[PDB]
Amino acid sequence: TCPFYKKIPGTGFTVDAFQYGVVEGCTAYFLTHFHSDHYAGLSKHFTFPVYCSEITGNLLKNKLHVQEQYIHPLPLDTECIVNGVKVVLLDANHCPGAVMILFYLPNGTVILHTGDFRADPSMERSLLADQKVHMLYLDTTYCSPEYTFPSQQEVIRFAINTAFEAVTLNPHALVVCGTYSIGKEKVFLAIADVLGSKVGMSQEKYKTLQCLNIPEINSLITTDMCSSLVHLLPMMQINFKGLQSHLKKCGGKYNQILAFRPTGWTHSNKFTRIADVIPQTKGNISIYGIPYSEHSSYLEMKRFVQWLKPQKIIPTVNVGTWKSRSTMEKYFREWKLEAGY
Ligand code: NI
Numbered sequence: 001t002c003p004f005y006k007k008i009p010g011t012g013f014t015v016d017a018f019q020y021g022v023v024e025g026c027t028a029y030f031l032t033h034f035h036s037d038h039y040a041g042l043s044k045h046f047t048f049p050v051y052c053s054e055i056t057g058n059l060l061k062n063k064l065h066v067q068e069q070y071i072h073p074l075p076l077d078t079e080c081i082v083n084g085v086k087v088v089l090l091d092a093n094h095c096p097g098a099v100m101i102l103f104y105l106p107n108g109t110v111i112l113h114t115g116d117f118r119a120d121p122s123m124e125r126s127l128l129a130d131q132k133v134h135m136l137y138l139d140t141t142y143c144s145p146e147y148t149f150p151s152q153q154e155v156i157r158f159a160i161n162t163a164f165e166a167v168t169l170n171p172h173a174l175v176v177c178g179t180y181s182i183g184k185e186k187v188f189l190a191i192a193d194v195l196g197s198k199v200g201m202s203q204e205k206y207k208t209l210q211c212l213n214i215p216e217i218n219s220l221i222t223t224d225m226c227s228s229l230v231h232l233l234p235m236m237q238i239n240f241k242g243l244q245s246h247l248k249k250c251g252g253k254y255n256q257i258l259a260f261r262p263t264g265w266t267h268s269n270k271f272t273r274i275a276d277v278i279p280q281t282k283g284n285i286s287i288y289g290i291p292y293s294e295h296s297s298y299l300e301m302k303r304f305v306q307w308l309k310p311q312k313i314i315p316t317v318n319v320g321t322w323k324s325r326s327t328m329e330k331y332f333r334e335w336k337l338e339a340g341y
Contacts, residue, residue, distance in 0.1 A: 005314050005315070009105070010106065010109070014029050016030070017029065031052045032116065033099065035181055053099050055213055058097075063208065087102060089102075092116060092118075093117060093122075094115065094117050094183070095181070095183030099115055110132060111134065114138055116139050118294050133309075135312045140318055143317075143331060144327070144331075150274045155187075163175050164194045167258075172256065173256040173258055174254035176258070177233075178236075179205070182208065185212075189220060192230040198220060200222055203223055206222075240282045240287075261287060302335055309341040
């Protein structure tokens with residue numbers, strides 16, 4: 001059955017709760033973003049109202065084949081009414097179309113659900129600053145002080161300079177970027193833009209990108225692999241064997257590969273700065289691991305919560321074991337004692 005952390009008190013709303021069949025009482029199902037864990041259980045067979053951003057609606061329609069009658073897209077940064085209750089969707093700074101939702105309850109309680117998010121100080125001057133928030137449903141993916149990472153912009157700058165140098169040294173090198181879902185598009189779009197190229201990709205991936213409301217998209221991406229010097233492949237193919245295999249497929253049009261694996265955190269964040277990063281190399285193929293995160297670091301999460309000063313926190317990630325919950329509650333109390341709320 002649907003856990004309490006996916007229910008919004010004193011409404012018939014749920015959030016990211018599609019895997020439990022019909023939820024008793026639920027009149028509106030919200031979807032924060034188009035990642036399989038969150039949408040799990042949604043298909044062309046679903047027949048209840050789904051509320052979401054315009055981008056998330058495009059994906060539901062075109063990728064999952066959810067029937068149009070059941071998709072209720074809402075604009076961002078706009079007060080809307082859903083089944084008699086005031087809501088606002090805000091940018092989550094996660095993947096394309098990902099939202100946080102602000103719910104103004106009839107009794108006067110205010111609840112923020114972050115979805116998945118990468119906390120940023122620009123969120124301190126949104127509609128959130130206008131009133132007190134009593135309860136916070138929080139993306140606790142990286143809620144532990146070891147989880148540090150560079151800014152998105154540091155990582156992109158590094159990727160850009162690396163790619164530009166390699167292709168100027170060898171104009172027959174191919175650049176490859178690994179991917180498994182939506183998110184982290186700036187990695188491959190920034191590399192292509194410094195090389196004067198479109199990004200080549202499969203038909204399924206191109207169809208996905210065509211849903212994302214990216215300006216001038218037709219000028220940036222193609223299904224003609226031949227004509228492009230940046231290619232997208234599934235993350236699972238980003239290894240020496242998969243990359244040599246792909247190089248054979250391209251018809252001797254390239255004689256070297258440089259590949260990027262955008263990952264979350266891995267243990268080497270605790271010493272290395274982005275400027276120290278060096279690739280793994282076997283022959284004419286080099287692979288760079290780059291920590292491009294679309295989740296809050298510990299410090300980013302802490303700052304946001306200490307600003308917001310919620311009366312209660314409800315974790316939405318790593319809640320499956322008592323040890324994790326206990327650990328997280330300890331950090332929430334520290335933050336509250338330091339900041340005086
Ligand atoms: Ni996500």
